């Protein structure tokens, strides 16, 4: 394996493992807040037992979430030295502000919530729980703001003096169109995950005669919250698709498997095999005039294809080669007025210059074959992105159907009258996790040739590390994560089997 | 009096009289929905008595609101024939759609709500009440969308063939920036009005020993709803001020009494006398670096003054004179290729051409004095706009303070422990009406030289009516409105004095 590929795989595994526990925390903390609010308002002590029992599992998941967060934090410096040195001036503000506000709030008040039952009164405990939920959500807000800036740079200009991109406007950095939609979408997905978790455990309890007081209320809360959250997350997924179409046409084309530009009634593929040796799909199942309506919100707005995008990036590749030559001349102390004036133009194509640097050993003289190789490498692997998008959409639709059925059964007041409803709720437990992992993988793999979109390719953003030095860390973290996952899943299963009646 | 001024005064009186009863309906229908929801959820029958008692007054106000709505609808055709013929292609969609959906919903379901107590169950009655509230709010939505398009035209292009402005894009017509903010702001103001009405009547009841069960719950509902609505309406008022600054600099300058452009730390006047004989204020009280921060959300963005706006409109006046000459030549059948090509340019200044037509008897030859008169008439009367804005802001601040005090007293559970709180709630009853009328007057008077902003002046939009023909209608409607107001206020006072215990 290559060093860059090994580091990419390490970041992939670490991110997936960390996000196996984040949506559960996001949903479960708000459901705990709901139970505490109901206990405060109604005054019935059943909801206090419910929130204690669910907070046990919440803490069990939260411990491992915190454990993985540290590695997620330090991986930028350990494995992406050049990436950090290049984009830190604009990337440090969200990362620092999140730890300054949201991480502090959640970290302090989670302990205050766990250990403040006897000391704090009902109102103070409710306020502490709400603070925990809001801090946990604001941390996701800032992290997803950073990731959205990665997807769509804004308020960023290259500086010759520091050889890095520096912040230009904080206002448009915070309020970039991609970041807001991404944040709301991911948070709604986490809400869906938590609600489905609660519903699955409640349905498992109700399938037997073990619990009927805590189980019914928990199932009702989960059903209502899941229906609202699934509606919100489907709407925000549509909005995210529109934003990706507007900002990153390459990612949209990879998602829909569109190779060649087609007239406005562009048929939306539902099943295809995007082979990359030949720039075409296989046994495609096309629904006419579907993707064009969704992506552009109207007609007569053709969606660019991968071939057209490569053809358009070819002049961008030439300009990037020129920009890279100019930047290397600048960095070597060659202060020429002509060079200084020329670098201001064609300055935004330096990422394509780095792509050519990867694909061309000699920058001064480049053949057509190297340009073809760079154009081929300018797009990600279409098939994994396509299948991840399809899996995510299908699982989202299944979640919508299941939660609508659960809400209909709950409002009727007859939840346990049908065994099949509870069985469906149980077997739909892994679906939110599958969908959320697929969506995150598609998001972070559709921009594959770019660590920062059109700014810095991932290949050149890697640090200076050897195969063994990275392999040791990869093996260590993989083994520790496997052991921790085994222990955490064992504890979660044990305390779900134990039931709230034990405590 | 002049015919145009008489028609303007008639529309002023009719609009003010109609809107004396609209915010009360908007707030009260949602408060009735709140009471019905509480009755359905808790099951206690006290809230049913509360919603019956408040729905009596709601219907009393609703009847006169409906009565005034018809005149508001037909006044466009009766007194503004040219305005309608000019802007109907773009103005009919909101007016027709509102009556198609929201007016139908509210009209049917208000009768269903009043007469469906015994027949419909609790859930159907609650759904009917919610439908009434949503229809009443959607009617305001569409009407304010039309008014916002008036304030800031969008998707409008002049057509030589029909001599009128025709719709270009419905999407940007609906979602224009001014209309959304105006709608949310006005609806929040109506919510504040309704909540303050409920709070005032409840405080009057609590000042005596007449009522303590209905009064306390009604006061709590009014206090919570009023606090939330006052926060929302202050935020939306700030947003509306920003939108007015961005779109209509003349209106903002009139509101703040700014005559000459000043450096970025522009001092916000709080007290001034904007004399118009001399383009300056009198005994101004200036707070430095206040209006520039609020209007532009930053510094180094100077706010244009009235003198600068007139100087900029002078070339617009010349271009409008040219456009009016070209349009008159086109309309007379003079189909010249040169004229056809030339009319496409300087086409958007036709409103200034109409202004010159009003201020210049001969369009072909115009002296500098006529241009000066047109420039003077291009801005509204600064003093009424300034004082209306100040009155609205002060009354909004007082509403915020009163409702915060009421919420603090309510959450403590001790509402009747302080007589001064109830007295303040009572004496704050006229303040929402004063503020809302002042705000509407400022909104519709800041654009005074324009029936449509930079498109059609109000003077040229009038129909062909005589002094006596308009005076008869004015006298008739004024007398009928006076009698109806006397009867309605007498009934409202009588049934507020009677109390819910009577029914």
């Amino acid at each position: 394996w290559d060093v860059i590929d090994l580091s990419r795989w390490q970041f992939a595994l670490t991110a997936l493992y960390h996000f196996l526990f984040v949506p559960l925390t996001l949903g479960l903390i708000f459901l705990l807040a709901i139970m505490e609010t109901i206990y405060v308002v109604t005054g019935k002590t059943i909801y206090r037992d419910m929130t204690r029992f669910w907070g046990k599992l919440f803490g069990i998941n939260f411990a491992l979430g915190v454990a993985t967060g540290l590695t997620m934090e330090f991986q930028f410096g350990t494995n992406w030295s050049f990436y950090s040195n290049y984009v830190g001036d604009i990337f440090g503000a969200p990362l620092a502000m999140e730890a300054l506000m949201a991480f502090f709030l959640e970290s302090t008040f989670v302990g205050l919530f766990f250990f403040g039952w006897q000391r704090l009164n009902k109102y103070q405990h409710l306020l502490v729980t709400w603070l925990v939920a809001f801090g946990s959500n604001l941390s996701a807000l800032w992290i997803l703001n950073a990731n959205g800036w990665m997807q769509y740079p804004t308020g960023a200009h290259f500086d010759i003096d520091t050889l890095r991109m520096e912040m230009t406007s904080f206002s448009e950095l915070v309020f970039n169109p991609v970041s807001q939609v991404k944040f709301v979408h991911t948070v709604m997905a986490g809400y869906v995950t938590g609600a489905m978790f609660i519903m699955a455990i409640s349905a498992w309890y109700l399938l037997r005669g073990r619990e009927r007081n805590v189980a019914l209320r928990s199932f009702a809360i989960g059903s209502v919250f899941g229906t609202l959250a699934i509606i919100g997350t489907l709407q925000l997924g549509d909005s995210s698709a529109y934003e990706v179409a507007q900002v990153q046409p390459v990612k949209l084309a990879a998602m829909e498997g569109e190779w060649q530009t087609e007239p406005a009634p562009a048929p939306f593929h539902v099943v295809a095999w995007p082979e990359q040796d030949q720039e075409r799909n296989a046994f495609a199942l096309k629904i006419p005039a579907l993707l064009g309506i969704l992506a552009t919100h109207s007609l007569d707005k053709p969606v660019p294809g991968l071939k057209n995008l490569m053809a358009e990036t070819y002049p961008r590749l030439q300009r990037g080669r020129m920009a890279w030559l100019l930047m290397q001349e600048i960095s070597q102390g060659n202060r020429e007025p002509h060079v200084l004036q020329a670098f201001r133009g064609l300055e935004g194509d330096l990422g394509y210059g780095m792509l050519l640097s990867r694909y061309a050993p000699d920058m001064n003289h480049v053949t057509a074959a190297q340009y073809q190789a760079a154009m081929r490498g300018a797009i990600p692997q279409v098939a994994p992105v396509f299948w991840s998008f399809r899996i995510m959409v299908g699982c989202g639709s299944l979640l919508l159907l299941v939660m609508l059925i659960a809400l209909v059964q709950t409002l009727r007041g007859k939840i346990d009258q049908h065994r099949w409803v509870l069985k469906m709720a149980l077997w739909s437990l892994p679906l939110p996790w599958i969908a959320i992992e697929a969506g995150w993988f598609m998001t972070e793999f559709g921009r594959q040739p770019w660590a920062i979109q059109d700014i810095l390719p991932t290949y050149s953003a890697h640090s200076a590390l050897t195969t063994g030095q990275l392999a040791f860390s990869l093996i260590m973290i993989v083994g520790l994560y496997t052991l921790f996952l085994i222990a955490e899943v064992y504890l979660m299963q044990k305390y779900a089997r134990l039931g709230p009646s034990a405590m | 009096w002049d015919v145009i001024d008489l028609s303007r005064w008639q529309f002023a009186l009719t609009a003010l009289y109609h809107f004396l009863f609209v915010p009360l309906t908007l707030g009260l229908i949602f408060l009735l929905a709140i009471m019905e929801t509480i009755y359905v959820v808790t099951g206690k029958t006290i809230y049913r008595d509360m919603t019956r008692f408040w729905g009596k007054l709601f219907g009393i106000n609703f009847a006169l609101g409906v009565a005034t709505g018809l005149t508001m609808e037909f006044q466009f055709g009766t007194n503004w024939s040219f305005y309608s013929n000019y802007v109907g292609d773009i103005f009919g969609a909101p007016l027709a759609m509102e009556a198609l959906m929201a007016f139908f919903l509210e009209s049917t379901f208000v009768g269903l709500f009043f007469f469906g107590w015994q027949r419909l169950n609790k859930y159907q009655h609650l759904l009917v009440t919610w439908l009434v509230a949503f229809g009443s709010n959607l009617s305001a939505l569409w009407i304010l969308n039309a008014n916002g398009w008036m304030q800031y035209p969008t998707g409008a292009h002049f057509d030589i063939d029909t001599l009128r402005m025709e719709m270009t894009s419905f999407s940007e017509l609906v979602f224009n920036p001014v209309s959304q903010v105006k709608f949310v702001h006005t609806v929040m103001a109506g919510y504040v009005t309704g909540a303050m009405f409920i709070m005032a009547i409840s405080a009057w009841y609590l000042l005596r020993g007449r009522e303590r069960n209905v009064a306390l719950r009604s006061f709590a509902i009014g206090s919570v709803f009023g606090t939330l609505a006052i926060i929302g309406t202050l935020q939306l008022g700030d947003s509306s001020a920003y939108e007015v600054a961005q779109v209509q600099p003349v209106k903002l300058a009139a509101m703040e009494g700014e005559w000459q452009t000043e450096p970025a730390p522009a001092p916000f006047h709080v007290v001034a006398w904007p004399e118009q004989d001399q383009e300056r204020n009198a005994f101004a009280l200036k707070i430095p670096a206040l209006l520039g921060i609020l209007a532009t959300h930053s510094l180094d963005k100077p706010v244009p003054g009235l003198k600068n706006l007139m100087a900029e409109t002078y070339p617009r006046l010349q271009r409008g004179r040219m456009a009016w000459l070209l349009m008159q030549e086109i309309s007379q059948g003079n189909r010249e290729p040169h004229v056809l090509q030339a009319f496409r340019g300087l086409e958007g200044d036709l409103g200034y051409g109409m202004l010159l037509s009003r201020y210049a008897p001969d369009m072909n030859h115009v002296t500098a004095a006529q241009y000066q008169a047109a420039m003077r008439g291009a801005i509204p009367q600064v003093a009424p706009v300034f004082w209306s804005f100040r009155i609205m802001v002060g009354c909004g601040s007082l509403l915020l303070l009163v409702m915060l005090i009421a919420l603090v007293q309510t959450l403590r559970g001790k509402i009747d422990q302080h007589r001064w709180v109830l007295k303040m709630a009572l004496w704050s009853l006229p303040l929402p009406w004063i503020a809302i009328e002042a705000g509407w007057f400022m909104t519709e008077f800041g654009r005074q030289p324009w029936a449509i902003q930079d498109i059609l002046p109000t003077y040229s939009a009038h129909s062909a009516l005589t002094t006596g023909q308009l005076a008869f209608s004015l006298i008739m409607i004024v007398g009928l409105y006076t009698l109806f107001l006397i009867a309605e206020v007498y009934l409202m006072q009588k049934y507020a004095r009677l109390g819910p215990s009577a029914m």
């Binding site: 109901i38 019935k44 807001q180 944040f183 019914l216 209320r217 009702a220 209502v224 | 359905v40």
Partner: peptide, 28 residues
Amino acid sequence: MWYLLWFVGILLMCSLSTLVLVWLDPRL
């Protein structure tokens, strides 16, 4: 502006769930 929308929406979802549970608790 999606941040304020999300804030209002999550508070709305919380209050809706609380109200539904308050209404439905006696019926269980």
